[PDB]
Write a protein that binds this ligand. Sequence first.
Ligand SMILES: *C([C])([C])=[C]C(=O)[C][C]C(=O)N1[C][C]N([C]C2=[C]C3=C(S2)C(N2[C][C]O[C][C]2)=NC(C2=C4[C]=N[N]C4=[C][C]=[C]2)=N3)[C][C]1
Length: 886
Amino acid sequence: NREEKILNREIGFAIGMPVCEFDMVKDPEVQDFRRNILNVCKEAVDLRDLNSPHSRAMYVYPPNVESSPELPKHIYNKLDKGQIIVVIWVIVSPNNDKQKYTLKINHDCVPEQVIAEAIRKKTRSMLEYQGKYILKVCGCDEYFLEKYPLSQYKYIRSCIMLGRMPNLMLMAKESLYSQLPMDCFTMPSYSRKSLWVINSALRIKILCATYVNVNDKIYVRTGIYHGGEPLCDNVNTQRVPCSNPRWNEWLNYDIYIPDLPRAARLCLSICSHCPLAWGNINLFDYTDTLVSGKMALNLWPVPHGLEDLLNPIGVTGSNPNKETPCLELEFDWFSSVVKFPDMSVIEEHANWSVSREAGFSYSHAGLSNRLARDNELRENDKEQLKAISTRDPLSEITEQEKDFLWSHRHYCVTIPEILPKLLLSVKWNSRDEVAQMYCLVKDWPPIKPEQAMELLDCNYPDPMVRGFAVRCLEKYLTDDKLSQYLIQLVQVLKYEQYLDNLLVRFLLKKALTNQRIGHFFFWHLKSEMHNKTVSQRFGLLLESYCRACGMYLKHLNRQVEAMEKLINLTDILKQEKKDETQKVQMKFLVEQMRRPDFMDALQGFLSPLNPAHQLGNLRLEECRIMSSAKRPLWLNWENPDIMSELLFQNNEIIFKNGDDLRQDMLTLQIIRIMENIWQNQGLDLRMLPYGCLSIGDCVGLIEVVRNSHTIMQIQCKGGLKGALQFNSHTLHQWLKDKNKGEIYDAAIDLFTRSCAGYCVATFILGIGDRHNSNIMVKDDGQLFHIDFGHFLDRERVPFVLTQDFLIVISCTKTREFERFQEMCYKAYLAIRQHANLFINLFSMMLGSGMPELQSFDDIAYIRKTLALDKTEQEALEYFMKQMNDA
Ligand SMILES: *C([C])([C])=[C]C(=O)[C][C]C(=O)N1[C][C]N([C]C2=[C]C3=C(S2)C(N2[C][C]O[C][C]2)=NC(C2=C4[C]=N[N]C4=[C][C]=[C]2)=N3)[C][C]1
């Protein structure tokens, strides 16, 4: 009906594919997903409409807050006896005259209390109307709707740290609520055995192949896997000529069918040894059914630099493009459909196995190193389990250590954080052990979200394990932290066996409960729709999101359309007008930007970098085509916020169409985390994790930091014509000229602190080497880095402290450089202590096709730079040596 067909066009524009493509998919799982996911949409809508309009205002404008109200000791010191000075603005006339009221208030004040005192100062002039008012940040669309202490709001904490005066606007409730239009979720047209009693070894037939188009013989190599680990020995068909690709071969593996775990996967590949193509298949379907009968798999091309003939970290499922090597399989058949057993059966088997081992005599337990001896665990080996739990995720557990953990599996519950080590020590090809592990996991106590995230990576495919990890996230993950780790959580969806799972339901709920979260959820999902390995999953999830997010769908289509214009325009530059002058390129740009359909599409929408930023009219006089060969556009928009002068009058963003910005995006995430760690640990090393967002196949947006210049910019602008640019003091003089008088010390102080941070950060992450063009400096002396090209690959210092920077700290033999060295040393230690977090963050990211991050071996570089297997004092000594080598 009318509204449904219009809604489909909108959704089709949002994603990039029409909805009716999903209607044509004749696959029970896809159609079930579309239908069954709608319960989450329904729940999310009902939560929003629960306590209107305030319930719906907090969905659209959620409070951007820190996870804790506790201020680190140095942050509290900046207050005047624990009190912050805030300025409160009121638009009083229809003429829009601004009146400011400055307050000195407690840092932990509730917004309502801050509004009360603002009215007290306003009423003083005259010598009523209580809580009909809300606070807004001047210059952007962020509100303080919730009853948090004022300091806990990020903006106000930033203003404390940076020393800035926070400028808030007082605003009437019904003005905001009026703007929130009544969205209307509607339901779409599409919305409406045997068990372990099988005594046999697993066979799989391989019938033939087609589309094996090529220039020795060929053969199919197969293997049965659980995650990265082979459940048994791999098995191969015979070498037969490529002219007649027909085998007809029942291959017998070394697995009892009853032992096949839930996430068991067949991994196959056609090989000439060189693997020509590959494919993986779940042996169980989404309904717990062991898959039987004839089946056809369209294979994928091999990725570059894949050593083994199989690809078990590879994504499961048939290729969308059916003009690729196709392989016809056939599985076994029995007297009925075979289903994986219920938890009740699994518990009965597990409880049976537990009491049987309770009765094992000394000698019986002698026969296997995996059998627990009850009441014979001493304090020495209890400490060994703690030491094993306190190691990194890339540390190899030996087969003796595995037997050992598993022997003491019941004691491991008293040290919950050991769980990922205990799960890797399980033999996932024993139903006896797996059933006990399920039971241990069922009652396993809650571990921190940071630690839980590891169990969603590619090492832990089992749904009972993943369900627990998701369950921890639901309990302990704040929306702040969800936003922070959102990109990793989006990636690990690729590792899920089925479209309908506990993780995707968790993320979608939050995306639909919190528009900040939904924004980036949409863009992260939309940027990989080119990647046919994930297009159907992400496409269907985007369909469900767009169908249920409300009016924000209209605002996303603005942004999508805006990016389509920029992608269209820059494609014309780097293809049609490839090597013309800057004048002729700029002329062409202006003429095409000024066309009516272009001109409306590129103004009056929300910044995809930060949707609280309204992008008004273009300042085309400030827009330019940049010197980088890929031709990134520098774009300047007006900020149409009434009090834009207070935050920033102009919002300017670099749009780039050509290069992969996913690496830069990951490095900037990490820099922010590292900084949070330091700021919580009490040392103020101010970093600068500016906005960076990938929106497609090598298309993306970069925030411009206002009042910033590269080192060469400082050297040239400060360098006489004819002369050479090599003058090292020129940087120090520039900072001296910008920061005259008593301000000078603060500039040098912020310069050292920021430099010590980017020294430590770049060394650890192994960033691409630093030019004078790569390093930047704000006018107040804040140093930071821009083009983070690659990471993770004797080990390199990327940021070699040349004289220029060292003279600004002072030059080597001084009290100023010693204190700076002590900043770097203490900084490096803090990240070592949190090594597991960063190791886990990178590990969740292997599903992304980032070239510098394909195998776990890539992540190992962090184990070398952080020096984990060494001691802490010897690790500080390692760092000292790598820097003095220079
Ligand atoms: C003398 C030789 C005469 C001086 C000159 O005339 C040469 C000037 C010069 O070479 N410049 C280098 C390029 N810049 C323009 C900029 C390029 C980039 C900028 S600014 C930024 N910024 C974003 C952050 O805010 C500040 C600026 N970023 C990037 C960029 C980024 C950022 N993240 N990832 C990423 C990848 C690629 C590029 N480029 C003029 C001076």
